[PDB]
Amino acid sequence: AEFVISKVDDLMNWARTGSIWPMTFGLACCAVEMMHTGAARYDLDRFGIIFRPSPRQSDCMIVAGTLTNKMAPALRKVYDQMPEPRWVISMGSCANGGGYYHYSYSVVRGCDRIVPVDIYVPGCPPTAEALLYGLLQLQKKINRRKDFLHWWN
Amino acid sequence: AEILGIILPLLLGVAFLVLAERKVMAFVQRRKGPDVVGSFGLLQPLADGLKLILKEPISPSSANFFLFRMAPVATFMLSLVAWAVVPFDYGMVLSDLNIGLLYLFAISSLGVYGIIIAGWSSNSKYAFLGALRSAAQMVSYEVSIGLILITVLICVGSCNLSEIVMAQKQIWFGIPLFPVLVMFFISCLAETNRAPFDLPEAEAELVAGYNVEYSSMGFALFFLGEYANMILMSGLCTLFFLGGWLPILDLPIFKKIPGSIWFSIKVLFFLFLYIWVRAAFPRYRYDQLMGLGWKVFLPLSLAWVVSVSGLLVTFQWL
Amino acid sequence: VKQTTGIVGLDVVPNARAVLIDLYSKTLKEIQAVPEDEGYRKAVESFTRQRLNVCKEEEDWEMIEKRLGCGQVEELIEEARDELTLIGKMIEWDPWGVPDDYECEVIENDAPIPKHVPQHR
Amino acid sequence: KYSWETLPKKWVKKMERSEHGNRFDTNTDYLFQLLCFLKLHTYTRVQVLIDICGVDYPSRKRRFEVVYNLLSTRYNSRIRVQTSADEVTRISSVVSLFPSAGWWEREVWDMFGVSFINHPDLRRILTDYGFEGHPLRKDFPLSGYVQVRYDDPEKRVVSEPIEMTQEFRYFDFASPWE
Amino acid sequence: RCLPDGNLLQTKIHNIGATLVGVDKFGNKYYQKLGDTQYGRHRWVEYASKDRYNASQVPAEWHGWLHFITDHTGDELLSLKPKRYGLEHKENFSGEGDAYIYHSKGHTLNPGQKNWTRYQSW
Amino acid sequence: MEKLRMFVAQEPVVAASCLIGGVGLFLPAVVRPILDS
Amino acid sequence: DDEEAEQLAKEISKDWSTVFERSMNTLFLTEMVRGLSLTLKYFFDPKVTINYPFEKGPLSPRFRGEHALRRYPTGEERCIACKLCEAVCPAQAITIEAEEREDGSRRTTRYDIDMTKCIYCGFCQEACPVDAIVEGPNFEFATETHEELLYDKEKLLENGDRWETEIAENLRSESLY
Amino acid sequence: VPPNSANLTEARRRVFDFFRAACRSIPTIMDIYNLQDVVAPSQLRYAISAQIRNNAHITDPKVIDLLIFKGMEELTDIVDHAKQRHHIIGQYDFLKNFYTSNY
Amino acid sequence: AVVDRVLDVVKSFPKVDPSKVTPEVHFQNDLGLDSLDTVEIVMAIEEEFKLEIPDKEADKIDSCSLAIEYVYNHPMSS
Amino acid sequence: AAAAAAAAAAAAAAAAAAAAAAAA
Amino acid sequence: PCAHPEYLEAVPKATEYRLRCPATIDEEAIVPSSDPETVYNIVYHGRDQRRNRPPIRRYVLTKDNVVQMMNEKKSFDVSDFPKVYLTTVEEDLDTRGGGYE
Amino acid sequence: FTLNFGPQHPAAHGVLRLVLEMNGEVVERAEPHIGLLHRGTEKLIEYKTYLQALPYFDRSDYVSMMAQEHAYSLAVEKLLNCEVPLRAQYIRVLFCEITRILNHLLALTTHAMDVGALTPFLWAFEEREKLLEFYERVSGARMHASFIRPGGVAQDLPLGLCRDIDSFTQQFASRIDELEEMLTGNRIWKQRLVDIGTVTAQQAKDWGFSGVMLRGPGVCWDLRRAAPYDVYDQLDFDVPVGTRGDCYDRYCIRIEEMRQSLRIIVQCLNQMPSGMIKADDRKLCPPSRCRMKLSMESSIHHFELYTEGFSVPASSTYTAVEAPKGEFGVFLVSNGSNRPYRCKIRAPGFAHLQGLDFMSKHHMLADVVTIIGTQDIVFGEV
Ligand code: SF4
Ligand code: SF4
Ligand code: SF4
């Protein structure tokens, strides 16, 4: 019946939620907090998250820090070369929304102006666990995909 | 045929070596590695795989399909065909070649082609020069591995790998020629890239250093190739120097002495040594690296062929 | 006998005293080209005379340092050569003499500074 | 202070302070010449251009005030030579004396607009590439003129349209009686 | 158990020596394994929803004890939660359908989209 | 010799290769003719 | 000079049984085996890691996380609309509009903190006179969509009633400072 | 570059210098950003001349110096791939207002 | 040869009138053009005839006749 | 290339503090 | 055979550390605000720091003043010169306290 | 031959956008591109009060947070003449020094992860997640602890923080030793660092390095010995000063400066006077919550200090402390009003990253990441 489709979606989502390697656009301190979320205490290699250093092979892109109006084209160019089942996480106030620099001329009012965002880690310096919970919310966003059921319409 | 029984288990070995490296190199860094996906990350390799398989391409580009869509196939086929002659236990080699060792040398000399071609088909000057540098490194620590194998060959009678592991019943060549094992390991580290010797594999310069059209299959096949080449070049430091499938020969009452299990234990030791030595040491910069394969591991390899030839000719130990 | 100046780049000079005497004589000779009633010439003359004197009296570089308390003789040579550059530069674009108007505003404030702020020692 | 006695009186032209760090508010013409002094001088050895702080006083006639800080690692003292150059007065550049002045003067020109004479590679360092306008002035609004950047049908491109945002709320905290 | 598919196995490899200190309303069992070793790993929570669990399911009565900010188990702060305005937790339904997710008062998804025009039209 | 020690310090691997190799070019040179007994 | 510096730095280690020490510590890589040994000691030692969702990192009652508008024990939002936090806010996240309610006591018709435009510096918690706005130790409120992340006027910041049991604890323990 | 503009004459001389520079650089502009098909060299010369003429009524020499400097900045950031190309193609009565807004 | 094409490029110029253009026409006297337009016409000359016209000489062409006597004398004429 | 190669020889490690160890 | 001279025995894993969790008020802190002498004596203009400062004395120097000063400065005798910040380097391994601070 | 060498490992050096003009593998010039992290900090501070201005400073250098709040505080006390207590000074140093440790623990092992050593990164980051248990405990936020306010310091330490900082300092000599035994002895390290980015002292002075890159070259210049700006004139510590200037000296300094900072932490712990936490001048320091609620005159100041501000008198000072990156100084012109006026932030990394051009000339392309390593280039300050 549909049960086979439900289980193949569960399987695809388990894959894409188990191994989700983000191109960590670590601009600024939220990259230092992201480095703590990649560090020994809160493992991100535990949840499968492997910080890729290249946009070419990466399921996610944890943009962190102040997206400057000059690093906006570079972020967009990097986001355009991720393989289609990609997601973006905004980490820190400066990356998710205007932030401390909302009214700065050189700061875009949140990466939601350049890349379409799927989970905004909240808190200007998010606790390393908070970025980790943002990623555990991206995992939920994967677990709600069911792409096969939609391919069968 | 029974080539499935040596490629499929090797595919599983490579897939679980990505996890073994992440997990061991993580334990080193005081952190559990992949630990949520499976019971202990045991399903994490399948997750990485099934993810890379389900990732839509960035551009289809199936037109250029004979140039660089069979070059990773070539690299991987070579890394897998050098496993025929590798004997896991007495009479468990798939094809006992009486010139087995030289055949491994030739397989490496063709892996050079694999790298060069798969780098030239990437129309990226930086990536192509990186692939050429990686090939020159893999081939400059091949004269040193060549001479190290000439040492372990002088000790043995013939190139037959089953004989080289049968010639160690008295003592493993790791005990007398330990300085040579250190040079074969530090060369197998450098022949393959995964090492303190991986500037072409500096985290970023690797991905942008093998191809432009990834499609995921290329990324997985290169890493599956690097990890099989690693299982192989660790299955050579354990045939030649460690006793291929030989116990310590104490003949315990608790131990019924299986052969392939001993070969497995030793290749696990050398894989764990690959990981440990990736964790604990800085990279060599490829400009001190090439000046270590010529100025350090070639003189110290030539000396060893003259030392293990002399000391075995004077006293008739040959 | 000096092994090395701790500073990098300031190479130890064996003939420290001799080149110091040379540089200070050059400085005394070259400073004559600036008007006498300028604070710069009084300063140059005075300290160059003091250092040339103490360099002629003492023999070792260590005694030059000990009496002329100005660091190391290599840094002293750097200072003397930079001073020669400045005197040969000051000859050009001569800034001497006060102009006719010369509106100079000594905005000499004296706010008390808390001292848990840096200032200097 | 010793530095004021030896210094040619004309070089410290306009002002001179005596606390909160001492300063020689000089004239733009005698600036690099004044920076040549205080460096390559035996009793005043600065050698270290710490900072070049553009300061914009809109109510002056010489709007900007290029505040050259200077540390003297030898004598352990810090002098702040200043200048005054309006929007269209090219001021002497001291990258020839202290080569650290290169980027600081690029930033002073970028933020303010005080072009520097014979400064090699005087190019906007901080602001965006196609940036028109000088931010750290006073009359430059905080949110910028045309500085929103969003993606659009001009794919792979972020446009630079006129700006619109939640209005920056300026709070008039300043109280009477100072 | 029966979950070899999660890091929940790491928690169930804990609890071997741990003592159970209370259990909140939702079922989350709050454990403590002190004395043995590894400070920072001596207070956790077993979410009682072995699948579909996530952080923020830990109520405020325990979210103090469990982050080591306090030493008051939720069975002790439950005598301090205010009765008049006290509200149960909400699990942070972020994305799980509208009317569970939060919405501002103009989002056009919020029932009763208010109009902000300060002038009252005629 | 002073320069010999300067060479076995600056370049240990070409001075301990011309000595892990001497023991191989020296054993069959003299130690083998010695083994006439 | 570098030539003479090399000659002398190699004539410092030039006495037999010191050239030998350095040769056996650059041939039998010995500096490196002390690296491998330490790395092994750490491979076998317990791991400083935290299986996150089940146990979380240590915090403090001063921890600044999700902003919550407190209430007085007897209902009645504590937030009299002084606008001090709207003033002190560095990022100007809080937008406060005030209206004399029918009861007569001032209250905020609009108290919207924009969490995305917010630096979580705790200035609002300090500036508020009655402790009306405090940061709840939540810090776990990652939202799928940006509009949810803008915390509405006194309705979602009114979810601090759930966090009051922990916020009241943190305040009762921090008020000594 | 020192402001040798002690008079409008030197400033105008270097204006013509910058104009010759931009004109003789139009080849690389058309090449790097691919306008040799959409725009004609006559049209780019027309636009550069309309720029230099739109700001021709500057009786101040230093303001002309600074204008030429901004122009050289724009050019040098157009010659090299510092700025993109979709702006270079763009760089090249009362009632009808009343109907739209109040301003 | 060169005269015909310099005439054509002065004619087709987007800031002139083809009537007053003549082998004797002057940029300021009979064409009524600005010095910037003169330098632009000189740029047109050196891009149509591929010549590398120095500015010190380019300043001195004020009439089409001088344009002729300077486009002819170029040994590198194109 | 005649570029100055990074010679990995140097003087031996000797921790060099400032002169203010005991009495400034 | 490594960096363990009975001193790495101070290991990173603490296991008894922050034994009193922060929000547990075993002892109620006091954190004095003002010195005891300044509780019931709130006279401020004496204690003031913002505004209790001498005013800025900006007086002009004309040519006469500076030529007078240049003529008054007869000679630059020593002690009319800025003192050098003397700092030399000196090798020391662990002698300060014996490695124990 | 131009190469657009960008961020090799993102999340470590975020917006690094060098444009290297190479010669084969030998770099002929390195042209760094700035502005990719140019938030409007030197403009946004002109628009906010002296209190609202402080949070920008912990966001100026993101790996050494409180050092910049300490450099700003000392620039709004240089004007205010705001004498802070002894306990405020000792806490302020015990956290400026914990910040020196938090920075060298990152700027060493992030550098050592760019070079290739993967494990020192994670050991040092466990150490940093121990020190953020102090930041997060004393103020609230693990990274941006807007804690060193102008008058004194935000609020007193919790009643168990010195015991925990002690239990950390006892076990921190061993962590430095491990970071040292893993990197100092290695021949793969020395080779990767010795004679890399050598800066003769005249160059480190010219280019205004003034940091751990001015004590590599051998210039004994620490603004805690030169311009003691706190209890530093009471605290004993030796400033390690290099003798060659190569990136192996700057590493050895940053790994000794991480021990002298341990000495300073242990001293600040052992001698921390039980005094008031903020300056008694309640027109520069908002009164406590308890006082402003009970006292009407304190409530007025809590209102005019969290809305109006100080209105520090009209002046202009350059207060420079020894931040871990280097001499971080904030030139703070102050119009009489309550908002600063061109709060210019001299940040090392703007002067250091200038040095990349001449430091990495004729070094191989793989060295250009080692130079960026030892400069401690954090682009928030650039
Ligand atoms: S949002 Fe806050 S923590 Fe994140 S990068 Fe911006 S200032 Fe740093
Ligand atoms: S912490 Fe409070 S005052 Fe500071 S920006 Fe956020 S909401 Fe505003
Ligand atoms: S939250 Fe505090 S500062 Fe803001 S309006 Fe309410 S009482 Fe006033």
Q: Are strands G133-136 and J16-18 parallel, antiparallel or unpaired?
A: unpaired
Structure tokens at L242: 């290099």
Minimal CA–CA distance to B43: which of E5, A58, E3?
E5
G chain contacts of residue L307, beta-carbon cutoff 8 Å: 84, 87-88, 127
Query: What is the atom index within ligand 3 of the atom nearest the CA of G96?
Result: 5
Rounded Cα–Cα distance for residues B78 and B104 (Å): 10
- Are A66 and A28 in contact by the 8 Å Cβ rule? The answer is yes
Q: How far apart are CA B201 and CA B204, in angstroms?
A: 7
Query: Smallest Cβ distance to C6: which of L218, L225, L233?
Result: L218
Structural domain boundaries in chain I: 1-78
Q: Is A32 in the pocket of ligand 1 (CB under 6 A)?
A: no
Please state the separation of Cα D129 from the chain's center in Å.
20
Cα–Cα distance between L367 and B213 in angstroms, integer?
Answer: 29
The ligand minimizing its distance to the Cα of G119 is 2
How many domains are contained in chain H? Answer: 1
Measured torsion, CA atoms of residues G147, G148, G154, G157, in degrees rounded to the nearest 10: -140
Read off the amino acid at residue A81: Q
Tokens of G169: 């604890």
Closest C-alpha among L151, L81, A142 to residue B54:
A142
How far apart (Å, rounded) are the C-alpha atoms in residues D166 and I3? 64
| Architecture in CATH of L2-381 | Orthogonal Bundle (1.10)
- Yes or no: say if E41 and E58 are a contact pair by the CB < 8 Å rule: no
B173: CB partners within 8 A, 6+ apart: B152, B155, B180, B181, B240, B241
For D17, the token pair is: 């302070």
L300 Cβ neighbours under 8 A, 6+ residues apart: none
Task: For residue E59, give both structure tokens.
Answer: 């109520």
How far, CA to CA in Å, does K80 sit from each of A125, K74, K77, L103? Answer: 53, 12, 6, 42
The angle formed by the CA atoms of residues L137, L138 and L143, to the nearest 5 degrees, is 75
Residue C120 CB coordination number (10 Å): 17
Distance CA(D51)–CA(D69), nearest Å, equals: 5
Whether E74 and G72 have beta carbons less than 8 Å apart is answered as no
- Cβ contacts of D73 on chain K, cutoff 8 Å: 85
For residue L61, report the distance from its CA to the centre of ligand 1, in Å.
Answer: 11
Partners of residue E43 on adjacent β-strands: E32
E29 Cα–ligand 1 center, Å:
35
Strands of chain L, DSSP E = 2-3, 19-23, 26-31, 315-322, 327-334, 343-346
Q: Report whether residue G134 contacts ligand 2, using a CB cutoff of 6 Å.
A: no
Residue D170 forms contact with H (CB below 8 Å): no
- Determine the length of chain K: 101
Active site (annotated) includes residue I62 = no
Q: How far apart are CA L257 and CA L325, in angstroms?
A: 12
Q: How far apart are CA L128 and CA L179, in angstroms?
A: 13
**Structure tokens given for E30:** 């709050």
**Neighbour-count burial for G12-48, b at 16+ CB within 10 Å, e otherwise:** ebbeeeebeeebebbbebebbebbbbbbbebbeeebb
Residue ranges of E strands in K1-101: 57-61, 89-91
User: How many Å apart are CA G109 and CA G112, to the nearest integer?
Assistant: 10
**Could you tell me the distance, in angstroms and rounded to a whole number, from the CA of residue D41 to the centre of ligand 1?**
45
Q: Which two tokens stand for residue A82?
A: 């991720």
Token pair of L234 as six digits: 């009471």
DSSP string, B29-80: TTS--S-SSSTTSTTHHHHHHHHHHSSPPSS---SS-SSSSSHHHHHHHHHH
Q: How was this structure determined?
A: cryo-EM
The answer to whether the beta carbons of residues L265 and L102 sit under 8 Å apart is: no
Cross-chain residue pair K24–G173, CB shorter than 8 Å:
yes
Structure tokens that stand for B304 in this block? 């060893």
Best residue among A68, A94, A120 to mutate for probing ligand 1's pocket (most ligand atoms within 8 Å of CB) is A94
Cβ-contact E64, G169 below 8 angstroms: yes
Mutate to test the pocket of ligand 1, among A24, A25, A100, A124 (most ligand atoms within 8 A of CB): A124
Ligand 1 lined by A55 (C-beta under 6 Å): no
Q: Quote the CA–CA distance of D12 and A128 in Å, as a whole number.
A: 54
Tell me which residue in L202, L338, L350 faces D103 most closely, judged by beta carbons: L350
| Planar angle of CA K54, K56, K57, nearest 5 degrees | 105
Query: Which chains have at least 3 CB atom pairs separated by less than 8 Å from chain C?
Result: D, K, L
Q: Which residues of B touch E6 (CB under 8 A)?
A: 36
* Interchain contact, D2 vs K80, CB within 8 Å: yes
Please count the other Cβ atoms lying within 10 Å of the Cβ belonging to residue J14. 10
The conformation of residue J2, written as its DSSP 8-state character, comes to -
Q: How is residue C6 written in tokens?
A: 């701790």
Distance from C-alpha of L263 to C-alpha of L93, rounded to nearest angstrom: 12
D158 touches chain A (CB under 8 A): yes
Q: Say if residues L66 and C109 touch (Cβ distance below 8 Å).
A: no
Residue H74 domain boundaries: 1-103
Q: What angle do CA G29, G32, G35 make, to 5 degrees?
A: 155
